[PDB]
């Protein structure tokens, strides 16, 4: 766990998660896919403390899969990441908290607009045109003032993500082994396998 | 590792004539990296203004808590909660936790619907209320908006005067805070009318 | 922070 | 790095209209324990100063010595060591300011709070304080330990500010200072009944006042006292 | 430690400590230095008194300072040596401070400011 | 943060002007850009008085140099003095991060990274500070040698202010250099207050504020 | 700095008005003197949320014990109920108040400390400006205090708080509670602190501000 | 300073007014000398807010036990002050000197140290004070004295506790325990300092 | 263990005019929640039109300042009698504190009087000697609060030309000895009402060509 | 348990014979009554190896004062001993009672603290068992005793603090400094402990 | 710093060393050269602490350029080994120790045989076949100890250390930045530019 | 801290 | 405190 | 421990 980043574009939101899995000096994993799909529509990439990550992802997609059968129907991805806030608001006061950061990438197919949500393991949520968690964001922040614009398009938005991840390999200490890239649409969610 | 320094911010409150003002900036950081710039820290229930600073998490928390018992005691008493009435029910939700306190520094201001009375409050993290005539001030930045609403204000300012003193008591406050600033937003309070702009300020 | 004659 | 061992407890003064009144208690205490009741924290300076010293008593002694060396060195080669070149408050109080800040910059302090008052060679009071960490001020009312808590606010009602100086005699001020060495004794833990008083006046000169005692106190309302709250005998 | 002012001026203004070292120079064999267009020649001459010499191991006259500086003498071999030892120290302290080897005017300046502090330095010729 | 890189066209040198005591504000005027001679520089970050006093002690052993060697000194050779100086203090506690930049014929348009844990790095590319990361992330994905001198002095400025805003400890305003074979150009003080809404309007970038 | 002096019929308590954060003032005129039940009340000193919310539920349960025994209450009974309540906490609830009424029993003058310890005395102080007024108290007290004689004291010995004390200020609060009458609470008794005139006037000309945005809030349903 | 003296008579409990906070004296004329029974009291020493908390419980178990067994004897008094004092040993700072009454049994003292141990003694003293005068008590005390040689007897030794303690001083408070019944006495500094 | 250092609050304020400087500081001298004197001055003369001012720790501050005093004295022995500039002082007070980097004076400087040109200066220092010219500095216990205020009234930050749509900034200009004094009082008395270690009494020093003259201030004894 | 003692015909030091590591006792018959000269002794209370290095350098001091100057006064003594406890006080424990007789100044007692303080006084007390003795020794010393009476004052005085402190005990020796010269006394705990 | 290997093959000893620079979260440099020319024909590779790394490696390479001026000769592999692992002996024991880890690789021309010495901080030599420093040993160890031969070309002896440099960007988790690889043998060092 | 003969 | 970009 | 009336 360390690089997740996230970018809102026009019309979709665009994850990348490191592949890197690290335990002291030897990387036990160069292919670890560091999201899980909450809903049709709704995506959340986690990084923190190992153990953790997993755990709190795959039990909010437990309940958002539960609430999908109970109403026949998709929460937005605003309901999602509120409902996710709280449980980590809830867990940083419990007697051992979740030390997870999550972004919430979804496609709101009722507004028809891409939404991506940055929440920390205190239970700081935030919508962004663009996020990242960990180092990630002392580089791509700056980067993403520069060269991001509101209108452009899922490829626009790819070759911006490539300029971020070439910039976190020249610079950032640590060998990540590249990224898994995911798209979130009108259409659901697909993988880029290819990056 | 201060639960009140992490994400930074500032609230300041003042009263006019017949009006009240409450101002904050838009900050939300993670120590020296800044996040957000869009991080409104005023939020209203009917005609009560609440402005929250320090922890984020806390802040939305308490939003989302106050929102959910204005809510229920509108639909029982059939009427708005007034400012004096949300001040002790502030109090009393943050001395609830007084032993694992919300770590925020909330500021009340609104008008009396009934006596028409400008009110403002501040409260520490514990509960405890800080009535005022002329300002209450809040966040990371405290010592500056104390500094400066101390020597601008000056009582019985009309809302187009007092909207200069109150917006400048934040700005120059603000711009002597490292994690403080990124844009700011003014909320003017009259008996029946509410204007809400947002500063330019410098975003460094 | 806490208010504290 | 020191602790101090065996100590003295608050010293109190104030201006008047001529001169400069100065007090402390006789009292050594060795922690909770009372341990030495003879012990003189008042130490003149020729005819025109007093040193009052608080704090550690062996270091209060070294300083002793040193004033008393001070005299001795200032009489060498020095046929007006008793008149226009006679030692001055200012000078004594400069010279110990020194040593002390000196000493505290070594990481080795004199672990004591000192107030020089005397009268100059033009008449004018002279009233400073001077303690462990080398820092200095003036003031009308000047009190260390528990007599700046207990003892100024007294002394301020009399002179609170530079023009109630000339309108304060020497009775009224004496009377105050007796009366805040009454209060010490009432609430400081480690104050005795037992004090010296020492009075410069630019016209009389030095009175140095030993063995007086705190009188005229208050105690028969304890009687009327019964339990913490409830309890009626 | 030993103090004497040995070198010092006479009546004249000479300093007659200087003035015989200078007897020990003219005394030394003979060194002679001509630079051509693209080059320097260091010739010395090596007096014929003394057969039986091994000439593979004798100090040679002609002295590398560092690999593109050479000192050569005449007078006291015994004194020579000290002045190379310092020149070298000195050539390898400027490469390690001002990454780079030092210049010919820097070296002689060095060794004729070492031979100045002789000169009016106590308990020292 | 402060900035440094090679070029074509010579050496950009940017630097911020804020100063800092924790979370207070000191001063946003603050020259971190220290004029050794006409064709050296030094940029300061770290301990203020740390950076101020060894840069102008730094400045005093160059100008002796020239004085005995009647030469001005070599890059490498003024970074080593400051390198050097450093390294004694080791342990001591001394935070300086500082990059010479300069020109001389031997040697061409050169800089050095020297900081207070005793690192000496020639290299063509340096970000420095509290806000490095910002300033590497424009800096890196818009840097080509081939910059003209009017690209590679806007990409310079527009890296700090990068920086300034992100960076919660940078900003103030932006001090610009140009170092040619002729020796150092000032590019003026830029202030943010004025820079950022002006580059905003005129690049369209910043969408992250509210405009 | 708080004071509770006792007199001839009655007791009479005062506070000063001064509220830190630190070293910065928050409030210069705060109300230390609360109302625990009509004819009982109480100065507080230390944490400001603990002095409030401890007397305010002792208040709240001496009301209910007033109905329920349809009996006027005592200040036995809220020294009582606040010492246990203070005890439980281990010192915690950082509350140091001066108990102080008049009741069927009589006039009464008590202190409580933050651990659950109480005093009984004819003259008390609490507060970082205790040690300047109880200086005062223990110069100027006697036995056989007048209505009029206690004020001036009690107000002498907040006075030397405010002017001696850095944590004591601004202005000066009073309550009388007399034997056979109602109790009298004299809010800001001395204003001796009032702020000189401004030499200037920081009024700005309208449009000095520069704005981004305007839009109407809705307030209304 | 604090101590309790069985006599001819019956028993005397004495005892200092000083209250302390590090060197203040919070309290000059404090009362340590407390009923928790008629003619069964105790003296006060340690935590003010411990020894009070407890002489409260232990005044209300011998007022519930009057209730249905009639008066406890002091015995009886000194168990329930152990009970408390040893069970709650880690959270109190409590030196009680327990002294009562009893027409069969006559004057009896029960000490209680820090621990909650229970010694029953002809004389107790205690409080830091105490220290002072173990040397004078052991020497001057006799048993069977009258009540104006045991008034005497803690007077002189209170006088030299006070003395040489700086945590002990004021007015010397005693409580006089008889046949006859309840009596009060005090001594001002002005008598007791030139014995 | 023995702490060396000690807290004497207090708060100090310089101020730059066109032809003038002035050096302001409150005289309340205290230690924890007492107060030792409420006239006791920390700006000082000392000679050559500089006035200094060394605020924090007084016993470091009083030493420096000594310490300064000193420093013009033997710049007059050892070089004819020549002036000292205010440049040449700030960068003299510079080594004075940086020679102390490893057991530093906890105070916070500020020297004013005129530059070569005859122009107001005001040098502000850290406590181990970096050094900047400012037209405005607050230093010491409530610098926070009336730092941000000179920003705004000196420097007029934030302050832009009514009806410009916020473009045009209010332009720079110099005040008169009669408008910064009173922003001096105004700032002193707001300090005195939010800080409890401000009050007592003002003492300003104000520097002319003519030389340095004084005025004091009663402020709030509470 | 040390003490010194000043009487009518000159001066006695008394003290226990007790050395201690924690609750061991090491030597039950020390002797902490030392010679610096012919007519001037301590009594050494705190570490015995900082006592007994203290000790030999003054009496090295003195011996070579007596050389070239004469007999020493007591204060001289006193004055010896305090330079070297005050200017050592960072690394010493040593609490020593200064006891000599001149034929001008008949006997006089000093006692040096920790702090490396001096305090001429008519008699002095000192070390662990002096705390319990104060009230006692206060109450029965009298100025100009006889030798006899002194003797009685100084046994009853260390018996009590033997029997209270359990860092003192063993044998009492004393050592009379008169005109007549120098005695050496010893008391058994048969005899004292039964006083 | 962090990689420097070090392998001796039949007619030469190759060092490789990685080219990253790192502080905090920033790559600072991708083409460090982490080694100094001692002499012709020796060469020595370090890592450690920032700044004593280059500070040593000059220090030793000003040294050995001072004898070899001085003597007209070429100091031996073994020889130099000696005096720098004498260097660092004598600083473990300083005021400030240097924390340089060497390699020392030279050829040895009296012998005609390549010489590898690995040298830690505290000054401790072993003359080995192949040698690293820091985590790079837990990987390349166990690597060499299965495919080294002894007899091996200096193109064998690439080969193997490409095999290293592999496993190292495989399962190392910072990114090192690759290796400037340099070769040791009769005819003096030369640098491999394409690795 | 808390009040303590 | 002391100043530190 | 060393040894210590
Ligand atoms: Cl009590
Ligand atoms: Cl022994
Ligand atoms: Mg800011
Ligand atoms: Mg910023
Ligand atoms: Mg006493
Ligand atoms: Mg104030």
Chains 1, 11 share one sequence.
Not at chain 2, 42 to 50: A, E, N, S
Request: charged content about 25%; overall charge negative.
């Amino acid at each position: 766990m360390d690089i997740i980043l996230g970018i809102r574009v026009q019309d979709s939101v665009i994850l990348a998660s490191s592949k890197a899995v690290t335990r002291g000096i030897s990387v036990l994993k160069d292919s670890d896919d560091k999201t899980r799909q909450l809903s049709p529509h709704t995506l959340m990439s986690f990084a923190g403390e190992a153990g953790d990550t997993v755990q709190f992802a795959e039990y909010i997609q437990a309940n958002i899969q539960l609430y999908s059968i109970r109403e026949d129907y998709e929460l937005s991805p605003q309901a999602v990441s509120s409902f996710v806030r709280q449980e980590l608001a809830k867990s940083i006061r419990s007697r051992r908290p979740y030390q997870v950061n999550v972004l919430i990438g979804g496609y709101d197919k009722k507004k028809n607009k891409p939404e991506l949500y940055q929440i920390d393991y205190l239970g700081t949520k935030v919508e962004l045109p663009y996020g990242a968690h960990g180092y990630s964001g002392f580089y791509t922040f700056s980067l993403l003032d520069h060269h991001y614009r509101p209108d452009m398009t899922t490829e626009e938005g790819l070759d911006l993500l490539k300029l971020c991840v070439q910039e976190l390999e020249k610079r950032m200490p640590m060998d990540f082994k590249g990224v898994i890239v995911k798209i979130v649409d009108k259409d659901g969610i697909r993988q880029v396998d290819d990056f | 590792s201060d639960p009140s320094s992490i994400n930074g911010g500032i609230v300041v409150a003042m009263t006019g004539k017949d009006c009240v003002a409450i101002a904050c900036d838009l900050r939300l950081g993670s120590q020296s990296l800044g996040v957000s710039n869009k991080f409104e820290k005023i939020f209203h229930y009917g005609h009560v203004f609440l402005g929250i600073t320090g922890l984020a998490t806390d802040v939305t928390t308490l939003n989302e808590m106050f929102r959910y018992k204005t809510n229920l005691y509108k639909l029982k008493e059939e009427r708005a909660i007034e400012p004096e009435t949300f001040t002790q029910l502030v109090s009393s939700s943050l001395y609830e936790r007084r032993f694992g306190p919300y770590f925020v520094g909330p500021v009340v201001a609104g008008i009396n619907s009934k006596s028409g009375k400008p009110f403002i409050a501040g409260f520490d993290l514990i509960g405890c209320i800080d009535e005022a005539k002329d300002f209450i001030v809040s966040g990371t930045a405290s010592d500056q908006l104390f500094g400066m609403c101390e020597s601008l204000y000056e009582p019985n300012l009309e809302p187009e005067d007092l909207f200069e003193t109150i917006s400048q008591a934040l700005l120059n406050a603000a711009d002597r805070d490292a994690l403080s600033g990124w844009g700011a937003v003014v909320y003017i309070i009259k008996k029946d009318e509410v204007v809400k702009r947002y500063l330019k300020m410098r975003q460094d | 922070x806490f208010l504290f004659x | 790095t020191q602790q101090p061992i065996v100590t003295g407890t608050s010293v109190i003064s104030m201006k008047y209209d001529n001169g400069v009144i100065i007090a402390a208690d006789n009292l050594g205490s060795y922690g909770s324990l009372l341990r030495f009741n003879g012990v003189e924290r008042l130490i003149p300076v020729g005819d025109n100063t007093v040193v009052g010293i608080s704090g550690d008593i062996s270091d209060m002694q070294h300083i002793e010595r040193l004033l008393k060396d001070l005299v001795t060195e200032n009489a060498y080669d020095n046929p007006l060591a008793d008149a226009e070149e006679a030692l001055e408050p200012s000078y004594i109080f400069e010279y110990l300011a020194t040593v002390m800040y000196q000493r505290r910059s070594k990481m080795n302090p004199l672990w004591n709070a000192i107030i020089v008052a005397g009268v100059q060679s033009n008449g004018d009071q002279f009233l400073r304080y001077v303690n462990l960490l080398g820092v200095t001020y003036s003031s009308p009312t000047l009190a260390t330990g528990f007599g700046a808590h207990m003892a100024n606010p007294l002394l301020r009602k009399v002179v609170d500010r530079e023009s109630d100086i000339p309108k304060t005699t020497v009775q009224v001020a004496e009377e105050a200072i007796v009366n805040a060495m009454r209060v010490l004794y009432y609430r400081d833990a480690r104050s005795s009944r037992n004090f010296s008083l020492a009075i410069i006046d630019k016209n009389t000169g030095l009175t140095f006042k030993k063995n007086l005692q705190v009188e005229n106190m208050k105690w028969d309302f304890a009687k009327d006292i019964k339990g913490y709250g409830t309890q009626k005998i | 430690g030993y103090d004497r002012a040995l070198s010092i001026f006479s009546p004249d203004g000479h300093i007659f400590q200087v003035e015989y070292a200078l007897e020990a120079v003219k005394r030394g064999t003979c060194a002679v230095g001509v630079k051509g267009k693209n080059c320097v020649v260091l010739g010395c001459e090596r007096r014929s008194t003394l057969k039986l010499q091994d000439t593979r191991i004798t100090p040679s006259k002609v002295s590398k300072i560092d690999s593109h500086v050479v000192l050569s003498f005449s007078g006291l071999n015994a004194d020579s040596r000290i002045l190379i030892e310092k020149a070298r120290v000195e050539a390898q302290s400027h490469r390690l401070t001002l990454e780079d080897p030092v210049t010919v005017e820097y070296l002689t300046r060095y060794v004729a400011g070492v031979q100045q502090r002789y000169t009016q330095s106590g308990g020292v010729r | 943060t402060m900035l440094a890189f090679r070029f074509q066209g010579g050496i950009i040198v940017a630097v911020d002007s804020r100063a800092t005591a924790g979370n207070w504000v000191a001063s946003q005027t603050v020259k971190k850009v220290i004029e050794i001679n006409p064709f050296l520089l030094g940029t300061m970050a770290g301990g203020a008085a740390d950076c101020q006093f060894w840069e102008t002690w730094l400045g005093s052993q160059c100008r002796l140099h020239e004085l005995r060697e009647k030469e001005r000194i070599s890059v490498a050779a003024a970074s080593k003095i400051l390198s050097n100086l450093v390294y004694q203090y080791k342990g001591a506690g001394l935070s300086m991060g500082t990059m010479i930049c300069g020109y001389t014929r031997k040697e061409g348009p050169t800089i050095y990274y020297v900081d207070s844990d005793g690192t000496r790095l020639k290299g063509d590319i340096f970000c420095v500070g509290s806000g490095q990361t910002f300033a590497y992330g424009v800096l890196d994905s818009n840097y080509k040698w081939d910059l003209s001198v009017e690209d590679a002095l806007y990409l310079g400025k527009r890296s700090i202010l990068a920086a300034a805003h992100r960076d919660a400890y940078s900003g103030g305003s932006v001090n610009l250099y140009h170092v040619t074979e002729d020796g150092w150009i000032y590019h003026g003080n830029h202030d943010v207050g004025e820079l950022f809404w002006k580059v905003k309007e005129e690049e369209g970038s910043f969408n992250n504020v509210i405009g | 700095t708080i004071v509770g002096v006792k007199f001839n019929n009655g007791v009479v308590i005062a506070a000063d008005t001064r509220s830190t954060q630190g070293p910065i003032v928050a409030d210069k005129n705060c109300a230390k003197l609360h109302r625990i039940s009509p004819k009982i009340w109480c100065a507080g000193a230390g944490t400001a949320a603990d002095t409030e919310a401890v007397t305010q539920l002792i208040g709240s349960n001496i009301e209910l014990h007033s109905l329920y025994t349809s009996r006027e209450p005592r200040v036995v009974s809220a020294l009582q109920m606040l010492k246990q309540h203070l005890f439980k906490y281990q010192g915690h609830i950082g509350a140091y108040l001066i108990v102080a009424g008049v009741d069927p029993t009589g006039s009464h003058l008590f202190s409580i400390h933050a651990h659950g310890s109480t005093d009984v005395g004819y003259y008390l102080s609490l507060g970082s400006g205790s040690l300047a007024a109880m200086a005062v108290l223990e110069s100027h007290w006697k036995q056989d205090l007048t209505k009029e004689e206690a004020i001036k004291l009690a107000s002498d010995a907040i006075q030397a708080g405010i002017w001696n004390d850095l944590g004591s200020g601004s202005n000066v609060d009073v309550c009388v509670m007399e034997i056979g009458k109602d109790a009298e609470y004299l809010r800001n008794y001395l204003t001796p602190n009032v702020r000189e005139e401004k030499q200037k006037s920081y009024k700005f000309p309208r449009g000095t501000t520069a704005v981004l945005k305007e839009s109407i809030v809705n307030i209304c349903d | 300073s604090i101590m309790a003296v069985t006599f001819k008579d019956g028993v005397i409990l004495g005892a200092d007014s000083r209250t302390t906070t590090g060197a203040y004296i919070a309290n000059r004329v404090t009362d340590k000398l407390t009923r928790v029974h008629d003619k069964i009291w105790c003296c006060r020493s340690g935590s003010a807010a411990d020894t009070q908390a407890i002489a409260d419980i232990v005044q209300y178990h011998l007022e519930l036990y009057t209730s249905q067994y009639g008066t406890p004897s002091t015995e009886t008094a000194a168990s329930v002050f152990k009970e408390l004092c040893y069970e709650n040993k880690d959270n109190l700072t409590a030196g009680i000197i327990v002294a009562g009454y009893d027409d069969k049994n006559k004057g009896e003292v029960y000490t209680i140290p820090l621990g909650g141990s229970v010694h029953k003694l002809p004389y107790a003293i205690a409080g830091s004070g105490s220290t002072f005068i173990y040397g004078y008590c052991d020497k001057n005390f006799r048993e069977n004295m009258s009540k104006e040689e045991t008034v005497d007897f803690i007077k002189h030794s209170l006088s030299q506790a006070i003395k040489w303690d700086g945590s002990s001083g004021g007015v010397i408070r005693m409580v006089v325990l008889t046949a006859a019944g309840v009596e009060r006495l005090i001594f001002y500094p002005d008598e007791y300092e030139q014995l | 263990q023995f702490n060396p250092y000690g807290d004497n609050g207090g708060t100090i304020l310089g101020i730059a005019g066109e032809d003038f400087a002035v050096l302001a500081g409150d005289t309340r001298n205290i230690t924890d929640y007492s107060i030792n004197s409420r006239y006791e001055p920390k700006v000082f003369d000392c000679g050559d039109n500089i006035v200094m001012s060394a605020n924090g720790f007084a016993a470091d501050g009083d030493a420096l300042v000594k310490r300064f005093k000193n420093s013009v004295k033997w710049y007059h022995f050892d070089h004819n009698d020549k002036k000292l500039s205010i440049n040449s002082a700030a960068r003299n007070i510079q080594h004075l504190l940086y020679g102390k980097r490893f057991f530093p004076y906890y105070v916070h400087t500020i020297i004013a009087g005129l530059d070569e040109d005859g122009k107001g200066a005001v040098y502000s220092f850290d406590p181990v000697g970096s050094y900047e010219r400012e037209q405005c500095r607050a230093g010491g216990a409530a610098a926070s609060l009336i730092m941000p205020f000179l920003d705004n009234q000196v420097n007029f930050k934030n302050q832009y030309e009514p009806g410009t749509n916020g473009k045009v900034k209010k332009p720079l200009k110099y005040l008169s000895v009669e408008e910064v004094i009173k922003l001096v009082r105004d700032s002193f008395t707001s300090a005195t009402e939010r800080h409890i270690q401000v009050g007592d009494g003002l003492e300003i020093l104000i520097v002319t060509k003519d030389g340095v003259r004084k005025e004091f201030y009663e402020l709030k004894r509470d």
